[PDB]
Design a protein around this motif. Sequence first.
Motif, PDB file in Angstrom:
ATOM      1  N   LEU A 176      -1.680  -7.173   3.187  1.00 30.52           N
ATOM      2  CA  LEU A 176      -2.402  -6.607   2.082  1.00 30.52           C
ATOM      3  C   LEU A 176      -2.819  -7.824   1.181  1.00 30.52           C
ATOM      4  CD1 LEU A 176       0.110  -4.173   0.384  1.00 30.52           C
ATOM      5  CD2 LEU A 176      -2.481  -3.561   1.031  1.00 30.52           C
TER       6      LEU A 176
ATOM      7  N   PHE B  47       3.023  -5.722   6.684  1.00 31.85           N
ATOM      8  CA  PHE B  47       2.262  -4.968   5.990  1.00 31.85           C
ATOM      9  C   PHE B  47       1.989  -5.437   4.591  1.00 31.85           C
ATOM     10  CE2 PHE B  47       2.450  -1.264   2.359  1.00 31.85           C
ATOM     11  CZ  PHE B  47       0.991  -1.259   2.279  1.00 31.85           C
ATOM     12  N   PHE B  48       2.810  -6.154   3.849  1.00 33.65           N
ATOM     13  CA  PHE B  48       2.580  -6.916   2.717  1.00 33.65           C
ATOM     14  C   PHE B  48       1.491  -8.117   2.714  1.00 33.65           C
ATOM     15  CE2 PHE B  48       5.488  -3.434   0.817  1.00 33.65           C
ATOM     16  CZ  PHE B  48       4.819  -3.110  -0.110  1.00 33.65           C
TER      17      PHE B  48
ATOM     18  N   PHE C 230     -10.327   4.253  -2.907  1.00 32.61           N
ATOM     19  CA  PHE C 230      -8.988   4.340  -2.222  1.00 32.61           C
ATOM     20  C   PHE C 230      -8.408   5.639  -2.239  1.00 32.61           C
ATOM     21  CE2 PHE C 230      -8.978  -0.495  -3.060  1.00 32.61           C
ATOM     22  CZ  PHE C 230      -9.394  -0.730  -1.688  1.00 32.61           C
TER      23      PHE C 230
ATOM     24  N   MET D 120      -6.802   0.262   5.853  1.00 35.55           N
ATOM     25  CA  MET D 120      -6.857  -1.496   5.981  1.00 35.55           C
ATOM     26  C   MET D 120      -7.819  -1.995   6.932  1.00 35.55           C
ATOM     27  SD  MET D 120      -2.893  -1.996   4.827  1.00 35.55           S
ATOM     28  CE  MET D 120      -3.032  -4.020   4.890  1.00 35.55           C
TER      29      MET D 120
ATOM     30  N   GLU E  12      -6.742  -9.117  -0.093  1.00 39.08           N
ATOM     31  CA  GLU E  12      -6.663  -9.191  -1.727  1.00 39.08           C
ATOM     32  C   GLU E  12      -6.669  -7.929  -2.276  1.00 39.08           C
ATOM     33  OE1 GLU E  12     -10.782 -10.811  -2.132  1.00 39.08           O
ATOM     34  OE2 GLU E  12     -10.226 -12.608  -1.106  1.00 39.08           O
ATOM     35  N   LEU E  13      -5.389  -6.818  -1.506  1.00 36.55           N
ATOM     36  CA  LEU E  13      -5.056  -5.842  -1.867  1.00 36.55           C
ATOM     37  C   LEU E  13      -3.788  -5.760  -2.537  1.00 36.55           C
ATOM     38  CD1 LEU E  13      -6.467  -3.791   1.061  1.00 36.55           C
ATOM     39  CD2 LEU E  13      -7.319  -4.084  -1.361  1.00 36.55           C
ATOM     40  N   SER E  14      -3.328  -4.771  -3.194  1.00 36.94           N
ATOM     41  CA  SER E  14      -2.033  -4.492  -3.305  1.00 36.94           C
ATOM     42  C   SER E  14      -1.907  -2.842  -3.373  1.00 36.94           C
ATOM     43  CB  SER E  14      -1.723  -4.579  -4.989  1.00 36.94           C
ATOM     44  OG  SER E  14      -0.550  -4.314  -5.286  1.00 36.94           O
ATOM     45  N   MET E  15      -0.744  -2.127  -3.606  1.00 35.56           N
ATOM     46  CA  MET E  15      -0.777  -0.950  -3.396  1.00 35.56           C
ATOM     47  C   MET E  15       0.139  -0.360  -4.551  1.00 35.56           C
ATOM     48  SD  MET E  15       2.774   0.041  -1.493  1.00 35.56           S
ATOM     49  CE  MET E  15       2.968   1.022  -2.833  1.00 35.56           C
ATOM     50  N   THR E  16       0.043   1.150  -4.713  1.00 29.67           N
ATOM     51  CA  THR E  16       1.000   1.687  -5.786  1.00 29.67           C
ATOM     52  C   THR E  16       1.430   3.017  -5.218  1.00 29.67           C
ATOM     53  OG1 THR E  16      -1.013   2.792  -6.727  1.00 29.67           O
ATOM     54  CG2 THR E  16      -0.464   0.827  -7.607  1.00 29.67           C
ATOM     55  N   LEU E  17       2.468   3.302  -5.844  1.00 29.87           N
ATOM     56  CA  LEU E  17       2.970   4.671  -5.344  1.00 29.87           C
ATOM     57  C   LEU E  17       2.327   5.989  -6.414  1.00 29.87           C
ATOM     58  CD1 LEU E  17       6.907   3.973  -5.675  1.00 29.87           C
ATOM     59  CD2 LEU E  17       5.319   4.399  -3.403  1.00 29.87           C
TER      60      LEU E  17
END
Lengths: 71, 71
Positions: free
Chosen positions: A58, A54-55, A1, A14, A62-67
């Motif tokens: 996600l 978008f969320f 990623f 994605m 089966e994803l998340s995200m981070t800054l």
Amino acid sequence: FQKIYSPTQLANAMKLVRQQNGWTQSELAKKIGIKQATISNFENNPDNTTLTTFFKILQSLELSMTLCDAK
Amino acid sequence: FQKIYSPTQLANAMKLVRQQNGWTQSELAKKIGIKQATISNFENNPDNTTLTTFFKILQSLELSMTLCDAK
DNA sequence: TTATCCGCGATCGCGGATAA
DNA sequence: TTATCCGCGATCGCGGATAA
């Protein structure tokens, strides 16, 4: 990623996850209750896609995200 | 930086970064060429904010983002 | 400083579809 | 399977503002 800086890079990332896992747009759409059309417009034309869409996608991936830092 | 799962969590995270660095909405807006109003609507009502707005504000905050597993 | 307002054109995501 | 279409109500981000 990798770090991502634009809606186009995000959609490309994605879509790749979707394809690598062999998921169809319809499968994902069904799991989260949005239109397949909406997933299509996101993958090809993400600039004005909403954060909500978008969320949800996600989650279906089966994803998340981070800054993180722009470095 | 924690994993983020919703537009509300995202906006809360980014507002916190803005405040911790002592930046005003107007300062950020000016650096990236959008309205201060737009940053305000994002921080308080992010559900339908566009991906474009999101990525521009990220830039103004000196941030990027990455995908990760929903775990 | 920020939440909030007007009026605007543009685009969203919706239901419901289709081609090949 | 996916890009794409119609018609729809809703909301975006815009310019331009304001209160306190």
